Structure formats: structure tokens, C-alpha cells
Design a protein around this nucleic acid. Structure first.
Lengths: 97, 81, 141, 54, 216
RNA sequence: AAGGUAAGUAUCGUUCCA
């Protein structure tokens, strides 16, 4: 939540204050789509996206993917070592793995 | 060039008979689903905030979480330190 | 969190409870910057569209609206209150407190489960509904 | 206005009581987070340059 | 002994112009006044290097739409384009970013190119497996020096001598070495006792980590 | 110390408070 909030905060901050600010949900959907595409290992290349927006979204995806990998491996270590974990935690961890 | 409409039996231009057959058999009950879902979305009320509201809420959240935003770090709930 | 509609003063939340009759008003009292409140203010994001038919979600910052802290016991970091036709729908959890969900959960299906159960028990005309899951533990093992 | 004065007196007394190590503990935590901010930076300034490039 | 047997071989003089406080938290007018203050501008930061560092583009992180999992090949001159006034890298650190532009003012007899493959993320250290297309017997570096210094050097061409290639993850690695036997042109691959006269193409195909040159 | 409140509709008493 903090990383996505920071990315959206920066993008909306440098985005011009006009009526165009109606496009906040569009930016969030773009972020979610890029994250899904990385999760689904599918090529993601928006044609009309500006290169600075694309660069920032790539950096967001890379950072969240690094955290995703580390968290998945740490949770797996917790589970194999015998630590006490939740059922939904096991389900999400199995999906990530 | 004139042709004869297979459905109405009236002289028709030969250039239009293709889309004439496409559209003269337009299924009558299709009109409501064209004119029903659009009314539903016209009367539908939004679920998420307007974009300016997301912007303002993001500013307010940045005001507090200095562990992420700002340059002068402070407590989680504190405005500035 | 930031995506859901927000209420700024005391009148607005009372109106939002009153301005609806055919759904359930799910209000997340707390602080959207809280790690706890942000944990479930994204669950409430992921299901806001799904439960549009029978639920509307408003967010309230108790510091911005310091009018319901004393009456509804707003002192846990995060609180969820369900209202139906201007009537607080009590819900019986596994926890001792049966008026609120004062903890942020993780699964997007269970919250829709609870909201739909509240709606089902509120159409009948009850005041206390019973949750399907039991929260006297965490099922961790 | 005696109630407000009494409350202010007690609050000032309590605030005086925390001055036993306030100046040292706050400085220690200030120096302590700055060692943490090296290995683990902030997200916003991690996106500082791209935000500028926007 | 500012100049010893190893200093006058690999060390080279380097110029750095560094600007500070470009931070986005500053508004437009405040940053305009800051650059107007004449306190925060490019500075004389000439020093010495034992080896030139090479910063690579990040891994693609996405499959190419036509050929999935495409291998990222980048020409060497793109990397070496860092060392000129045209390009400037933001070595952000702590609170304020630092925009530095690099320049070469004394080419050492032998130029060492270290390659920043292994880097720590916010959470875990990874490697940057970006292949580089680099020649071995013809390269020109004259564009990276100021003309008031370019006249001194009549030899800006370097030939590869040794190459370092790493295997796998940082915690499980096995170095391999491509050595050039001078006089001949036999490039030999040594890992622990390996000896194999490779062709000048397997040097390009593999991902380099440390390169040794010779100005001749 | 808990995780053990069924939710309601009535007249009646009291009390602060407007």
C-alpha cells in the first residue's frame, strides 16, 4: 500500500492541475495492469504511454516485484521451519510460489 | 440500378441492398437492451471518489506518513518534526 | 484507501447513513494512514465494485470527525460499522465485541461474506446478525 | 478559567518530568533512524528523479 | 609515492561536475533561486581512478512482444557514453540527489573496466545479466576528452587483454577468465585449470564483468 | 481480565439537561 500510494502521489503531483485530474483512476488501473502483466509474465507495452510515465511504472513494478519475491521466500521459510501461519497466508504464498 | 426488397417488395437502390438486408431485419427486441443498459449506467452512481478527491486524500496521507513522503521524517501520525 | 469516498464533518456521515434505504452503509472509522486501517482499506477497495448492489462504503477520519468517538467507542485503531435504514446492525463475531470489526483482515471473500450476511439479516428486520466464521481464534496452527 | 489553568499546570509538570532523558532519547533516535535510512531509503526519494523527469 | 609501478599503469585523471539539491520537494521558484544562488552548481572535482566503472541498463523485466525472453544486448559505446559532458547520472544518496557528469583528462596506459552486475535492491541483492556487444581490437575514446587535453594523447585506441565472466547467483558463483596471449591471438578460457583457445566471438557472447585494455 | 450482550414493542418511576 505504501509503495503504490507513493507512486500514485508522485504521478498525480506532477500531473497538471487541470480538468485532466479526472484520470487518476486511469493511472491506478495502469499500475494494476502493469503489475498483473509482470505477475502473469506477459509482455506489457502500452503504445500511447509517455516514456516518463512508462519509466516510473516500470520502476514501481520492479520494486514491488522485488518485495514480492522476498516476501514470498520469507513466508515459505516461515512455513517450512514450522512457524505459525494462517490459511489465507498459505494460499497466497502458494500462489506466489 | 433498382432491385426488389425481399422483405417489403419495394424498389430499392442496388447500392444499399446489402446494408438494407443488414438493417431492415434489425431484431426488434435488440432495441431495449441497447436502450436499457445505457439507462442503467446513466442512472448509476459512482463508487470511487472523483480524481481531485484522490489527489486531496493522497496529500493528506502524505502529510502524516513521513516514513515514506516528505524529507523531514517524524512520527507516523505526527504532521511534521 | 484514498480511492473510496471520504466524509469530512459530522453532518456528512449522518446523511450518508440516512441517504440510503436499500443497501448497507459500511463505514471504516479510523485513520487512513494507520498501518492497520490501510491493511483493510485496500480490501474495501477490492470489493467496492462487487458489492455495489447491496453495499456502499464511506471512509471517516475520526480526527476530522470527532463526533462519534465517545458514543461508538472509537479508540481501537480501525473500526468497521454497518448501518441499515438508519439502524446500526449489530453483528456477532467470535470476539467479545459485537458492534464492530475492530481488526483489519486480509481475505477479500470473507468481507463480502460478512456484508452479504448483514444485508440478508437486515432485510428480514433483525438487529443482530450472526457471522458465518468464528473469530475466537485465528485458525493459524 | 481555573480548570484550564490547573490542566495546563499538570501538563507542564508532566512535560517537565519527561525532561530527564528527553533531549538525549530524541537525539539518539534521530541519529538511529539516519543509520537505517542508509540501507533502507525512503520510497518517495527512491522515485525522486523519475518524479522530476515527469 | 603518488606515482608507483601500478599507479602510472591503471590510474587516470578524471573530471566530475556535480550539482546538488535538484530534489523534487523544492518548488519551481525555489529551485530557480537555488540555482540562481550560485552556491549549488557544477564544481571542480578532478581526482584519480584506479578503474573505470560501467553502469548498465536495468534488465528488461518484461518479455518482448514478438520474441519472448529476449536477451538484452547493449553496445559498449552506450555504456562508455557516460564519460562525457553530454550525459549526467543522478547518484542520489540520503535526502538530496547528486547529479554528476564525468569526463576523462588522462588516459592510463591500460584501461580497466569494472562492470556493476551485482547490486542490492531495497530488499535483496540481484545481478544485472545484460549482455554487452564490445569489440576487442578497435575502439576510439577521443570523444570523451576535452580538446585542450586531446592534443596530448596520440593513442586513444585500446585492445582487450583479459575478460572476467561470472556464473549464476552471487552466493553461488564460478569465475571464468579470457586471457589473450600477446604476440599470438589465442584467447584462452581458464576457470580453475581449463585451457581452451576460443574464437573472438565467444568473448562477445558472454556477459563481461571486468575488462583489461591496452592503449598501445 | 476476557474470547459468555438475542435483538425488540410497551406503559411507569427518576434525574440531569434544552
Amino acid at each position: 500500500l505504501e509503495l503504490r500510494a507513493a507512486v500514485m502521489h508522485d504521478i498525480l503531483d506532477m500531473m497538471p492541475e487541470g480538468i485532466k485530474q479526472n484520470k487518476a483512476r486511469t493511472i491506478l488501473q495502469h499500475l494494476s495492469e502493469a503489475w498483473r502483466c509482470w505477475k502473469a509474465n506477459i509482455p506489457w507495452k502500452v503504445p500511447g504511454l509517455p516514456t516518463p510515465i512508462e519509466n516510473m511504472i516500470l520502476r514501481y513494478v520492479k520494486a514491488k516485484a522485488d518485495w514480492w519475491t522476498n516476501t514470498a521466500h520469507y513466508n515459505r521459510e516461515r512455513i517450512r521451519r514450522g512457524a505459525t501461519v494462517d490459511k489465507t497466508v498459505c494460499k497466497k504464498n502458494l500462489g506466489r510460489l | 440500378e433498382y432491385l426488389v426488397s425481399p422483405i417489403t417488395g419495394e424498389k430499392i437502390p442496388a447500392s444499399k441492398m446489402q446494408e438494407h438486408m443488414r438493417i431492415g431485419l434489425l431484431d426488434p427486441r435488440w432495441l431495449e437492451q441497447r436502450d436499457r443498459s445505457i439507462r442503467e449506467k446513466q442512472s448509476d452512481d459512482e463508487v470511487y471518489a472523483p480524481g481531485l478527491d484522490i489527489e486531496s486524500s493522497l496529500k493528506q496521507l502524505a502529510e502524516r506518513r513521513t516514513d515514506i513522503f516528505g524529507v523531514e521524517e517524524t512520527a507516523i501520525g505526527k504532521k511534521i518534526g | 484507501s484514498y480511492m473510496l469516498p471520504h466524509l469530512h464533518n459530522g453532518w456528512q456521515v449522518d446523511q450518508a447513513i440516512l441517504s440510503e434505504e436499500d443497501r448497507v452503509v459500511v463505514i471504516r472509522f479510523g485513520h487512513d494512514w494507520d498501518p492497520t486501517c490501510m491493511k483493510m482499506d485496500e480490501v474495501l477497495y477490492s470489493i467496492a465494485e462487487k458489492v455495489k448492489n447491496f453495499a456502499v462504503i464511506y471512509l471517516v477520519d475520526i480526527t476530522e470527525v470527532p463526533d462519534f468517538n465517545k458514543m461508538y467507542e472509537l479508540y481501537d485503531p480501525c473500526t468497521v460499522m454497518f448501518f441499515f435504514r438508519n439502524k446500526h446492525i449489530m453483528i456477532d463475531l467470535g470476539t467479545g465485541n459485537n458492534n464492530k470489526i475492530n481488526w483489519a483482515m486480509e481475505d477479500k471473500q470473507e468481507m463480502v461474506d460478512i456484508i452479504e450476511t448483514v444485508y440478508r439479516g437486515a432485510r428480514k428486520g433483525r438487529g443482530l446478525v450472526v457471522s458465518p466464521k468464528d473469530y475466537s481464534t485465528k485458525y493459524r496452527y | 478559567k481555573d480548570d484550564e489553568e490547573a490542566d495546563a499546570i499538570y501538563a507542564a509538570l508532566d512535560k517537565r518530568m519527561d525532561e530527564r532523558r528527553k533531549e538525549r532519547r530524541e537525539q539518539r533516535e534521530k541519529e538511529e533512524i539516519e543509520k537505517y535510512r542508509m540501507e533502507r531509503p525512503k520510497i518517495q526519494q527512491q522515485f525522486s528523479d523519475l518524479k522530476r523527469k515527469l | 609515492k603518488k606515482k608507483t609501478i601500478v599507479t602510472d599503469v591503471f590510474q587516470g585523471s578524471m573530471r566530475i561536475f556535480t550539482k546538488k539539491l535538484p530534489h523534487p520537494d523544492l518548488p519551481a521558484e525555489e529551485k530557480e533561486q537555488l540555482l540562481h544562488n550560485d552556491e549549488y552548481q557544477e564544481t571542480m572535482v578532478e581526482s584519480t581512478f584506479m578503474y573505470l566503472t560501467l553502469d548498465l541498463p536495468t534488465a528488461p523485466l518484461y518479455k518482448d512482444e514478438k520474441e519472448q525472453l529476449i536477451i538484452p544486448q547493449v553496445p559498449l559505446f552506450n555504456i562508455l557514453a557516460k564519460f562525457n559532458g553530454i550525459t549526467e547520472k543522478e547518484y542520489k544518496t540520503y535526502k538530496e540527489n547528486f547529479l554528476k557528469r564525468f569526463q576523462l583528462t588522462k588516459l592510463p596506459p591500460y584501461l580497466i573496466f569494472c562492470i556493476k552486475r551485482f547490486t542490492k535492491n531495497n530488499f535483496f541483492v540481484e545481478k544485472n545479466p545484460t549482455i554487452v556487444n564490445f569489440p576487442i581490437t578497435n575502439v576510439d575514446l577521443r570523444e570523451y576528452l576535452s580538446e585542450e587535453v586531446q592534443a596530448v594523447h596520440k593513442n586513444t585506441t585500446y585492445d582487450l587483454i583479459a575478460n572476467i565472466v561470472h556464473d549464476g547467483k552471487p552466493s553461488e558463483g564460478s569465475y571464468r577468465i579470457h586471457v589473450l596471449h600477446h604476440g599470438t591471438g589465442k584467447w584462452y578460457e581458464l576457470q580453475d585449470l581449463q585451457v581452451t583457445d576460443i574464437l573472438p566471438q565467444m568473448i562477445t557472447l558472454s556477459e563481461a564483468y571486468i575488462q583489461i585494455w591496452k592503449r598501445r
